[model samples]
Target: MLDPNLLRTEPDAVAEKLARRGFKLDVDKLRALEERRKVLQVQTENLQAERNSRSKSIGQAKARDIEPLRLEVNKLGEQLDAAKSELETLLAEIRDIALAIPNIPHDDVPVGRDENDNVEVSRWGTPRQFDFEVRDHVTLGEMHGGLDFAAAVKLTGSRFVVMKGQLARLHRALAQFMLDLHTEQHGYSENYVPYLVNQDTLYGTGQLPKFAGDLFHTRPLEEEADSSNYALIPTAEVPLTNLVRDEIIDEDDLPIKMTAHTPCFRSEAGSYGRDTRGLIRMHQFDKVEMVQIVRPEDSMAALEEMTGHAEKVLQLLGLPYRKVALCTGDMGFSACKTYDLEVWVPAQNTYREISSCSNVWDFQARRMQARCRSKSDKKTRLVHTLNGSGLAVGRTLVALMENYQQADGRIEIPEVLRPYMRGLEYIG
Candidate 1:
């Protein structure tokens, strides 16, 4: 959510900023609504004050043996109640409109329309030379412990996977590697978070109100009310970042870093056909997510450091990937700025995004009311929130298979993962 003060004070400035991101703000209507809201709020406050004053006067009159004043005060009470309810309605409308608006993009964010206009910041190790014909994961994963969509079809429907034996172990191993890397060397606290989250949790991360369709929901069987509805997490980012939701942290904890490994569930609403065959776009997948809550002064620099942490994962695994800065038009709802890491996929002869690190810059903290108190000032300030996938387990698995495959269609495990693979070198 944007600062209410911004919308109230400078709707034009906000509308203009939003325009660059391809969003049209109804300035005239919003200006009119704020004017009305200001008027009604004053009226409501005056009415309550008048009612209180009159009631006190009546009490004095009663002490002086005057019955007429008491009778009139009783009738004014109903008018006071009506005015209070009317003010409540007006505030609700203002909040709803404010919630729908996206945060203002940072000045450093490049102004552009979409991903095509995104700026490339850097590139890592080059894609390895392949001696034999390269095949996609689905083609290369046809061996033992490999992908078998037939079994997945019988168990669930489309956009699912069933990994057996070495394949399943390798998936687990990748997650373990990332969690270890982030916790040990990256200065993040490892966390085990719930896979199911409440609506407010999503709201804190800016996932609700706009992108609700790209999520999975479940009934709260324990409570039979619709209000008790819950949603399966699309990423550990939701739960990990939300750990600080509605909190007032001590100044010493200014930079709180956390990492988690969890299974993600997505509806992939409206994205039906794209990447439907392989593990590239599955209904469920594993990921290691990192979240940081820092003071406002440190957010921009924190973004660079966090992104570097993600790049470190690929560098250690010897995976080639590029860093891209997302344009204002293509950035996520909550992110003031974002950087996407696209890993080299030999099979596709190109790069595909495996991670996205974003700096939300109090956009989420304002929604979550997550704050930190300054020791000297005794004031609470909204903290900046950041999150990124250290790496997507499934996509990493795909990249490893395609980039490390040999001439005979056998997959060689990355040397770093050999210990996790029980000293095994190749998966045939």
Candidate 2:
């Protein structure tokens, strides 16, 4: 949520910034709503004050045996009721307009319409030069008898897969490795978070008002009068970042880092035909996410450090990858700035995004009231929120399978993962 002051004082400026990101802000509508709100608020307050004064005079008149003043006071009370209702309706309209507007991108972000304009910051380790023909994850998994897409589809429908034996073990191992790395080496506390969250949780994370279609929602099985309870957790980021929702922390705990590994559920409603094959896009996938709550001043630095933490995982696994700074138009709904890590894949002959690290810069904090007291001053302020996929476990697994595949169709485990693989260097 943007500061309401910005909307009132500089609606045009805010609208211009939003346009650069391909979002059209209804500036005229919001300004008109704000004007109505101001007028209604003053009218309501004045009427209330008048009614209070009149009621007091009526009480005094009653003591003096005057009946006409009491009738006047009752008429004033009716006027006050109408004025208050009008004020509330205008206020609600203004709130809805404000909530619909997205956070403006920072000045440093490239002004582009989409991902095509995103700038690549740097590339890491060189992609392996393969002498033999390479196969994608589907072929490799099928050859090993460890992946069953048909069975998965039969069991659950499209965008689902079943992995058995070594393939499933590799998937689990990737998550374990990411969780351990982030918690122990990356200075994040391991957390066990709820898989289901309420509507408010989604709203706090900037996912509810917009992008609701991208999520999987659950409703009560039995009939109920109220439609309040809904369970949908699209990513660990939703829950981990929301841990500080409505919380005020001490100054000493300036930076709160947390990590969790969980199965993310997404409806993928907008992506009808994109990446429908293999494990690239799934209805459910495992991910290890990292979240940070820090003072506003420390957020950008934390973003770089957190991006490095995600990059380190690929570095350790000897995966070739690059970091790209997402253009303003390509950034997520809640992120002020984002750095995406794209890992190399031999089969695709290109790099695909495996993780995204973002600095939300109090955008989420303001919505959730996640705050921290300052050490220098006793005042409380919204904290900067940051979140990243240490790496998506499924994508990382796919990268490993494709990048590390041998001529004999066996996959060589990365040295860092060998320990987790229990001394088995290869999986056929």
Candidate 3:
């Protein structure tokens, strides 16, 4: 949610910022609604005032034996009721329009359309040079009897997979390792969060009332007959970031850092023919998420620090990756700016995104009513909210399998993960 003051005072400015991100704000329509609202508000207030005055006069007239004053009071009451109802309808319309407007992008964010225009910031490590013929994760997992896509398709449908034994352990280990790293070394508090959340939670995170199609939804068995009763949680970010919904905190806690490991569910509704092979795209995957609530002045710096935290995971794991600053059009709805961490894959001979870190800059906090008091005066204000994937565990596991594959079809565990794997060094 953008500051309502922006919409009320300078909607044209808001519309211009939204245009840069390819979203058209109906400014003229909103202005018209505002005009109508102003008129209705004044009319409603005047009618109520008149009704109250007439009622008092009627009481005085009754004491003086006057019947006409009582009739005038009844007429005023009817007019007041009608005016109040009209005012309520106009107010609701204005609110609906205001809520639909997206947050404006920060001025420093690059102006461009889509991922192709995204700017690459830097690269880390080097793609491993393989002497033997390399295999994609799908081939390696099938040959080792650790992955079962056929069974997943039968049980669930496409874009799903099942991992057993070593592969499953490796997946779980990756999530545990990332969670431990973020919570311990990276100064983030570990959070246990819900996997299913309500529609308001999604709305606060800028995922709903707009992008409902890109999520997986479930309803109570009895309510499955009606689509309106469904609940969907697309990412741990939804529930985790919403923890501060309708809350005001002490300014001393300006930057609240938290991390959680949870299964993410996405319908991939708009991504039709992209990364359909292997574990690159899935309906469900485990991811360790990092979230922060910061003051406006510190949000940009926090964005860089948070992105670095995500890159550190790949660095510690010895994976080659690059960071890219997402262009205006490529950024998420709620983000003022974003950096995507793309990891190297040997089989694909290219880097693929494994995480995205963004600075929402109070966009979500405004929606959630998440706020903090000013350190000096104790005046409450919306706090900037940000979140990133420390790394998607499934994608990291796939990267490890493809980048660390031995000639004998064995996968070498990264040194950092060995301790989590009970000192086991390899997965064969």
Candidate 4:
């Protein structure tokens, strides 16, 4: 949620920023509603004041003379109630319009159309040059009992995979390795959160109102029979960042750092026909998520640090990766700025996104009402929220197989993960 004051006062500036994101803000409509709401608020307050004064005078005067005053006060009361109701309706309409608007892009974000306009900030490692003809992860998985798409289909239809034997262990180890690294090396508190969350949690993370189709929802059995307010979390970030929902924290606890390893489920609703093969795109995938709640001034810096934390994983695993600055139109729904970490995939002969670190600024904080208060003045202010995929475990697994594949179709487990894999060096 953006600051309503900003939108109400300077719709042009807001409209211009949104234009870079390929969004059009309904400036005239918002201003018209605001003007009407201001009128109704004044009208309601004046009627209430008049009614109070007249009612007070009634008790001070003779009983017979006060009868007419009482009736007049009652008439004012009715008018006041009507005006108040009108104001409430107008405010609600303004709020709904505000909710539909996307976050304004940061000045540092490139002004461009889409992913093709994104700027590459840096690159690390190198795409491996194979002496033998390269094969995709699907071809490599076929040599072993690693990936079982056939079994996945019989079990749960498309966009699913079944990993068996050593490959299954490797997949599990990737998440475990990421969790330990983030908790031990990065100082993030590890948390276990519910896979199912309420609608407010999704709204807090900017997932509701617009992106509902991309989610998998469950019947709200505990609430109302018709309300399917509970949804399967598309990513752990929803619950992790929502820890401070409707909370006021001490300035001393200025920054809250946390991480979680969870299975993310998505409908892949609009991505029909893209990456339909292999582990590239799946309905269910494992991920290690990192979330930070920081003071307003520190959010942009926190974004860089979070991006570094994700890059460290690729560095340790010896995977080639590049960092790209997402253009205004390419940033996520809640992010003002974003950096995507793309890892080298030998089969595709390119880099695919494995992590995206974003500084949502105070967009989500305003929605969740997550605020911080200082003892000095006792004033409360919204705290900024940031979230990133420490790394998508399944995609990392895919990169490993495709980049470290032996000429004979075996996978060389990255040295950093060997300890977690019971010292198993390779899998076929």
Ranked by lDDT from best down, the candidates are 4, 2, 1, 3
C-alpha RMSD in Å of predicted model 1 compared with the true structure: 2.3
What is the per-residue lDDT of model 3 for residues 1-428, given as tens digits with 9 covering 90 to 100?
A: 78877788888878888999999988888888888888888888888888888888867767665567777878888888888888888877876776666668788778998889899999999898888999999999987899899989999999899998999998988988899898889999998887877778888898877788888777556645543445556777898899999998888876889999888888866677888788888888888999998887889999999999999999999999999988889988788888999999999999999999999888898889988886687377788899999999889988999998999899999999999899999897
TM-scores of all predicted structures: 0.93, 0.93, 0.91, 0.92
* Model 2: per-residue Cα lDDT over 268-322, one tens digit each: 6678889878998998899999999998889989999999999999999999999
For model 4, the stretches where C-alpha displacement exceeds 4 angstroms are 46-85, 222-228
Report every candidate's CA lDDT: 0.87, 0.88, 0.87, 0.90
How far is 44's C-alpha from truth in model 3 (Å)? 2.2
Clashing pairs in 3: none
Superposition TM-score, candidate 4 onto the true structure: 0.92
Candidate that would win on lDDT: 4
lDDT per residue as tens, model 1, 244-304: 8889998787799999999999987677768867998888999999999999999999999
Residue 235, candidate 3: Cα error in Å is 1.2
State the displacement of the C-alpha of residue 45, model 4, in Å, after optimal TM-score superposition.
3.5
TM-score of 1: 0.93
RMSD of 3: 3.0
As for TM-score, the candidate ahead, 1 or 4, is 1
